[PDB]
Ligand binder design. Sequence first.
Ligand SMILES: CO[C@H]1C[C@H](O[C@H]2[C@H](C)[C@@H](O[C@@H]3O[C@H](C)C[C@H](N(C)C)[C@H]3O)[C@@H](C)C[C@]3(CO3)C(=O)[C@H](C)[C@@H](O)[C@@H](C)[C@@H](C)OC(=O)[C@@H]2C)O[C@@H](C)[C@@H]1O
Ligand SMILES: O=c1ccn([C@@H]2O[C@H](COP(=O)(O)OP(=O)(O)O)[C@@H](O)[C@H]2O)c(=O)[nH]1
Length: 392
Amino acid sequence: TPRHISFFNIPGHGHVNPSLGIVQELVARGHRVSYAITDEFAAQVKAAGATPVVYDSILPKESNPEESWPEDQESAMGLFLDEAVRVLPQLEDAYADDRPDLIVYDIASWPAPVLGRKWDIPFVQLSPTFVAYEGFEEDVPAVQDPTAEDGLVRFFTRLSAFLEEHGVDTPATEFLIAPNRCIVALPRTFQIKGDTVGDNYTFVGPTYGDRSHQGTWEGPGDGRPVLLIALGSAFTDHLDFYRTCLSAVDGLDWHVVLSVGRFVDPADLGEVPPNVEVHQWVPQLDILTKASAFITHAGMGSTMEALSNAVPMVAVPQIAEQTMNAERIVELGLGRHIPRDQVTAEKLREAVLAVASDPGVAERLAAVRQEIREAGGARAAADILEGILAEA
Ligand SMILES: CO[C@H]1C[C@H](O[C@H]2[C@H](C)[C@@H](O[C@@H]3O[C@H](C)C[C@H](N(C)C)[C@H]3O)[C@@H](C)C[C@]3(CO3)C(=O)[C@H](C)[C@@H](O)[C@@H](C)[C@@H](C)OC(=O)[C@@H]2C)O[C@@H](C)[C@@H]1O
Ligand SMILES: O=c1ccn([C@@H]2O[C@H](COP(=O)(O)OP(=O)(O)O)[C@@H](O)[C@H]2O)c(=O)[nH]1
């Protein structure tokens, strides 16, 4: 019997993209899927087969170059709280006459447990990044409730007030980091201390789907190796870095696709070498199916798309989460890590050439690609959700 499954997410490609393979699988299985997101993402969600439930957000739009995310967790958590306050009633109104049978929610979609409780329906977290392992709060002490110093006190005070007002008695830190049930969009082997993560998490590897909505990328079709350079969907405002990349690839016998993000006008790079094409935004997944190397910020989505395609990486992280991902890449022998303020043209060139030609890296990428093929993906995730629906 078809059920109504609602996805709650936040307006960022790194949070939305992994969910879409699960949407596509659920729709294929005959379920009615609705998807709470902003207008910016409605067309993409529609293409996946879901009905958008559009809400108004105060979060920085990845399409608006006049605003950006903060780099620090403290500020970001404040933003997600204020957004939760404002989004909660919008979703309650939208679903008033048509409550879902189950909610699948992103790590930052804090209205979900509130409404799951209110509506007495199951709610399952979908994590696009690594989850809390044994001792997590010591490594990431911003999640510890102290009740920048004043800022964290103010945040926890306000978070506790929100939760209590809306009938959630879960202690604040637990609310933030310990979901009752979570489907994780990476394999356990990549997860930091994955062996210490308990059975309320299931690691299914990347869950991205058919991204035909983005269309195809047409390569030169000359047999030359293709390098993708892309720093994700958020922390991309790095003109000097992109100029350094141009110098790095000049005279390289490779085709290069350079994605510069929404903050940088491609014309501000000037004349680019003849082997380079520059865009603000590219069909990254399609290009990664054709690529021989990838200069990446090591966001989890980008990491998992590359690994699914056995593409070696040179990681230049922006925020701490990405540094942790880059360290895992190094530890697993899948690429190189060059910290942001240690980048030069020569270093980038040497790294790309080294990772793309290393037979040991190639062997390890082949192994990891197979692990991902075995992890279960969107099929396993949909199975888990259907098991919950069978009871609910
Ligand atoms: C290890 O250091 C990390 C720790 C933490 O990295 C986060 C995450 C990924 C950040 O999101 C990112 O925030 C930046 C600002 C924008 C970005 N994009 C939308 C563009 C977004 O994905 C958070 C702020 C989002 C958030 C609200 O759910 C939380 O803070 C919660 C309570 C969170 O701690 C738990 C679920 C634990 C188990 O997960 C994590 O610690 C991940 C790894 O915050 C990062 C800023 C630090 O770099
Ligand atoms: O030009 C681009 C740049 C990024 N992406 C997609 O945006 C997502 C970025 O997510 P990630 O987790 O790597 O990083 P974040 O944007 O969260 O920092 C991935 O799915 C990419 O395929 C894309 O399609 N085209």
